[PDB]
C-alpha cells in the first residue's frame, strides 16, 4: 500500500507512535517518507546481506526473520513479510521496540540525516488528526 501522508499521520496516531519516547508524530512521518516514500512494500537490500522492510525499513539484522540473513535475531519476534503488509499494526509495534533500543531514532540513520533538526511538524501540517 502506498498511504497517502495524512493517512499515514493518522495511523500512526491510531497505533499509538504519536509521542511515543518523546518523538513527537511528525518525526514518525518524515521517517517514514525517506525510508519508503510510504510505501508498505518497500524492500532494500544492505551491504552485510541484511534486508530492510516496510515503511519504517526495519532490518532483519535484529528485527525480524527473513531466513536469508546468518547470525541475525528476530527480536520483534516476527516474519520480515509482516512488515510489508497494508496493515502498519507490525511495523509499528516493532519501532517502538527499536526506538526504546537506546539511541531513540538515530536507529534510522534516514531520520538522522534528513528528519533530525527540522521542522518536522510540516509533515502532519494540514492533517485531520
Ligand atoms: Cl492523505
Ligand atoms: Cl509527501
Ligand atoms: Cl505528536
Ligand atoms: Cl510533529
Ligand atoms: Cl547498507
Ligand atoms: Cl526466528
Ligand atoms: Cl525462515
Ligand atoms: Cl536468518
Ligand atoms: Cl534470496
Ligand atoms: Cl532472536
Ligand atoms: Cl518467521
Ligand atoms: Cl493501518
Ligand atoms: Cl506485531
Ligand atoms: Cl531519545
Ligand atoms: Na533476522
Known sequence: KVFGRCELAA???????????????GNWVCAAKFESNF???????????????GILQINSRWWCNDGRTPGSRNLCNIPCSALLSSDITASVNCAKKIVSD?????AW?????????????????????
Not at 109 to 129: E, F, M, P, S, Y
Open 11 to 25: 495511523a500512526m496516531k491510531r497505533h499509538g507512535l504519536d509521542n511515543y519516547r518523546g518523538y513527537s508524530l
Open 39 to 53: 510505501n508498505t512494500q518497500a524492500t532494500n537490500r544492505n551491504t552485510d546481506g541484511s534486508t530492510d522492510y
Open 102 to 106: 537506546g539511541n531513540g531514532m538515530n
Open 109 to 129: 540513520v534516514a531520520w538522522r540525516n534528513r528528519c533530525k533538526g527540522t521542522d518536522v511538524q510540516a509533515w502532519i501540517r494540514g492533517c485531520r488528526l
